[PDB]
Design a protein around this motif. Structure first.
Motif, PDB file in Angstrom:
ATOM      1  N   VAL A 130     -11.895  12.681  -5.813  1.00 23.61           N
ATOM      2  CA  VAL A 130     -10.743  11.943  -6.309  1.00 23.61           C
ATOM      3  C   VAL A 130     -10.252  11.063  -5.170  1.00 23.61           C
ATOM      4  O   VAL A 130      -9.919  11.577  -4.091  1.00 23.61           O
ATOM      5  CB  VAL A 130      -9.647  12.891  -6.805  1.00 23.61           C
ATOM      6  N   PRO A 131     -10.205   9.744  -5.352  1.00 25.25           N
ATOM      7  CA  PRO A 131      -9.875   8.844  -4.242  1.00 25.25           C
ATOM      8  C   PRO A 131      -8.463   9.013  -3.707  1.00 25.25           C
ATOM      9  O   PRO A 131      -7.684   9.829  -4.205  1.00 25.25           O
ATOM     10  CB  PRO A 131     -10.071   7.456  -4.858  1.00 25.25           C
ATOM     11  N   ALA A 132      -8.129   8.241  -2.679  1.00 27.47           N
ATOM     12  CA  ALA A 132      -6.871   8.374  -1.968  1.00 27.47           C
ATOM     13  C   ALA A 132      -5.899   7.278  -2.376  1.00 27.47           C
ATOM     14  O   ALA A 132      -6.299   6.211  -2.844  1.00 27.47           O
ATOM     15  CB  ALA A 132      -7.091   8.315  -0.458  1.00 27.47           C
ATOM     16  N   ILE A 133      -4.615   7.566  -2.204  1.00 23.58           N
ATOM     17  CA  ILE A 133      -3.547   6.596  -2.393  1.00 23.58           C
ATOM     18  C   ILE A 133      -2.637   6.664  -1.172  1.00 23.58           C
ATOM     19  O   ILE A 133      -2.386   7.748  -0.635  1.00 23.58           O
ATOM     20  CB  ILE A 133      -2.755   6.852  -3.695  1.00 23.58           C
ATOM     21  N   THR A 134      -2.172   5.510  -0.712  1.00 24.28           N
ATOM     22  CA  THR A 134      -1.292   5.430   0.444  1.00 24.28           C
ATOM     23  C   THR A 134       0.143   5.191   0.007  1.00 24.28           C
ATOM     24  O   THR A 134       0.462   5.126  -1.181  1.00 24.28           O
ATOM     25  CB  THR A 134      -1.731   4.325   1.410  1.00 24.28           C
ATOM     26  N   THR A 135       1.014   5.074   1.001  1.00 18.20           N
ATOM     27  CA  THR A 135       2.397   4.672   0.813  1.00 18.20           C
ATOM     28  C   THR A 135       2.723   3.581   1.817  1.00 18.20           C
ATOM     29  O   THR A 135       2.286   3.635   2.968  1.00 18.20           O
ATOM     30  CB  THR A 135       3.364   5.843   0.995  1.00 18.20           C
ATOM     31  N   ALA A 136       3.484   2.593   1.376  1.00 18.69           N
ATOM     32  CA  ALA A 136       3.956   1.521   2.233  1.00 18.69           C
ATOM     33  C   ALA A 136       5.314   1.885   2.816  1.00 18.69           C
ATOM     34  O   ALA A 136       6.019   2.760   2.311  1.00 18.69           O
ATOM     35  CB  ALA A 136       4.050   0.211   1.455  1.00 18.69           C
TER      36      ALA A 136
END
Lengths: 54, 55
Positions: free
Chosen positions: A48-54
């Motif tokens: 399951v791929p990754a998600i970042t935060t700004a």
């Protein structure tokens, strides 16, 4: 009295054993993965791929 | 304003025209930053477009 030699007649008249109609296989996600041979413990690990935060 | 008609005093209340204002400011900097060591970039990144840029 009179004796008649008769057969025992067997007939099929469309009486069957009432039995369920199948719907579940068509609605579930079948075989997104196939190469279970060639992975340890017959286990393919899905990433399951990754998600970042700004 | 209103005044009584045929009023003995003839003064008029002068109205004022006051223009108002408000400021709109550019005051924020939204960013996403990523740091990758040479090992992470060489060995752990495969695409860098669907793995770094899209996130």
């Amino acid at each position: 009295a009179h004796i008649f030699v008769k057969p025992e007649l067997v007939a099929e008249i469309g009486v069957k054993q009432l039995q369920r109609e199948i719907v579940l296989p068509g609605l579930v996600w079948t075989n997104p993965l196939t190469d279970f041979g060639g992975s340890k413990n017959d286990t393919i690990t899905v990433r399951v791929p990754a998600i970042t935060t700004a | 304003n209103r005044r009584d008609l045929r009023d003995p005093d003839r003064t008029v209340i002068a109205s004022e025209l006051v223009e108002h204002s408000f400021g709109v400011t550019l005051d924020k900097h939204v960013y996403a930053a990523l740091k990758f060591t040479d090992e992470q970039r060489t060995l752990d990144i495969r695409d860098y477009t669907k793995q770094v840029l899209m996130p």
